[PDB]
Amino acid sequence: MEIDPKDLTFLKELGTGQFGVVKYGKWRGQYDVAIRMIREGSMSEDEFIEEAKVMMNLSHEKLVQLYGVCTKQRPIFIITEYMANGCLLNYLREMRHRFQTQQLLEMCKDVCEAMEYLESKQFLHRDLAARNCLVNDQGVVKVSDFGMTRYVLDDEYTSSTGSKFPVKWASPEVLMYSKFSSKSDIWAFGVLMWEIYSLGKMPYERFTNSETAEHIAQGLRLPRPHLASERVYTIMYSCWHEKADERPSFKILLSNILDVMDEESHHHHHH
Numbered sequence: 253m254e255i256d257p258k259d260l261t262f263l264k265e266l267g268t269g270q271f272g273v274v275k276y277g278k279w280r281g282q283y284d285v286a287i288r289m290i291r292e293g294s295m296s297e298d299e300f301i302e303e304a305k306v307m308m309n310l311s312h313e314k315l316v317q318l319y320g321v322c323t324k325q326r327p328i329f330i331i332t333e334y335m336a337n338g339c340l341l342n343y344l345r346e347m348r349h350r351f352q353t354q355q356l357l358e359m360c361k362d363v364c365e366a367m368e369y370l371e372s373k374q375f376l377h378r379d380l381a382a383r384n385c386l387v388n389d390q391g392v393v394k395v396s397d398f399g400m401t402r403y404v405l406d407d408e409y410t411s412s413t414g415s416k417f418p419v420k421w422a423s424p425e426v427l428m429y430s431k432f433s434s435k436s437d438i439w440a441f442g443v444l445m446w447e448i449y450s451l452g453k454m455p456y457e458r459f460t461n462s463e464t465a466e467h468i469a470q471g472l473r474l475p476r477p478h479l480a481s482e483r484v485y486t487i488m489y490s491c492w493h494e495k496a497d498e499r500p501s502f503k504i505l506l507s508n509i510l511d512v513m514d515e516e517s518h519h520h521h522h523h
């Protein structure tokens with residue numbers, strides 16, 4: 253897991269993500285990799301380094317693969333699979349010019365498979381959203397940054413009442429009681445489905461975080477995206493049940509997505 257930084261070559265600046273600068277490079281002169289440089293003073297590094305070992309034991313084809321870390325240095329490096337098509341949000345914005353609606357449901361399936369795996373390992377993502385999903389060269393979507401917000405030092409990001417908290421993806425019990433679970437990830441997954449079918453539109457774009465909380469407390473939810481059929485909207489709406497126990501698991505949700513795929517292929521075969 254501990255990688256020698258001398259085995260890394262930096263070839264292209266990719267930009268800066270939530271958790272620091274990211275660069276494309278080669279590992280051992282053989283493998284394409286993305287190199288995340290954790291921003292100084294942003295993480296509880298001691299706890300993160302211990303949690304990083306648990307994140308390393310996770311492996312699934314729809315999870316962005318982690319190769320290792322460089323911790324005998326400052327800044328810390330995280331070495332990961334390189335996702336050629338970049339962040340899902342930017343990818344969705346570009347899809348507005350050419351796409352087929354079936355592709356959107358396939359994207360939801362990819363993420364749901366990744367979350368079903370994390371669910372089976374009792375591993376919470378805690379900030380599932382399009383901004384944390386990446387797309388490879390084949391258009392496959394993969395989930396990343398699972399569990400990374402646990403040890404963010406800025407309380408404005410981790411506190412349910414913080415100004416930077418992902419309120420617009422948070423379930424009621426997260427906003428009111430800071431109760432995180434796979435069922436809160438389910439809620440966020442529903443919002444992520446809405447993001448995909450809105451082709452990267454921000455949920456509750458014209459809402460303040462305070463107005464969003466009141467909106468959710470009133471039992472109101474996001475509107476049906478124009479590209480989402482009623483059958484598809486039923487799935488993402490099931491993620492938004494007021495009570496966590498009434499939301500489906502990722503295992504059930506994946507089967508529901510596959511079933512709707514069959515219904516969609518017969519959309520014109522009913523009276």
Ligand SMILES: */C(C)=C\C(=O)N1CCC[C@H]1c1nc(-c2ccc(C(=O)Nc3ccccn3)cc2)c2c(N)nccn12
Nearest residue numbers: 266267268269274286288330334335339383396397398
């Ligand atoms: C948005 C989805 C991505 C994003 O904001 N950026 C900014 C730079 C270009 C792009 C990007 N980020 C990554 C990337 C790299 C590493 C990690 C990571 O360390 N994940 C992690 C650590 C621990 C536990 C779980 N996950 C996440 C994201 C990236 C990659 N890999 N390829 C291309 C572009 N890109």
Ligand SMILES: [Br-]
Nearest residue numbers: 262263264265
């Ligand atoms: Br560079």
Ligand SMILES: [Br-]
Nearest residue numbers: 351352353354
């Ligand atoms: Br088509």
Ligand SMILES: [Br-]
Nearest residue numbers: 425429431496
């Ligand atoms: Br609760």
Ligand SMILES: [Br-]
Nearest residue numbers: 455456457475
């Ligand atoms: Br809205």
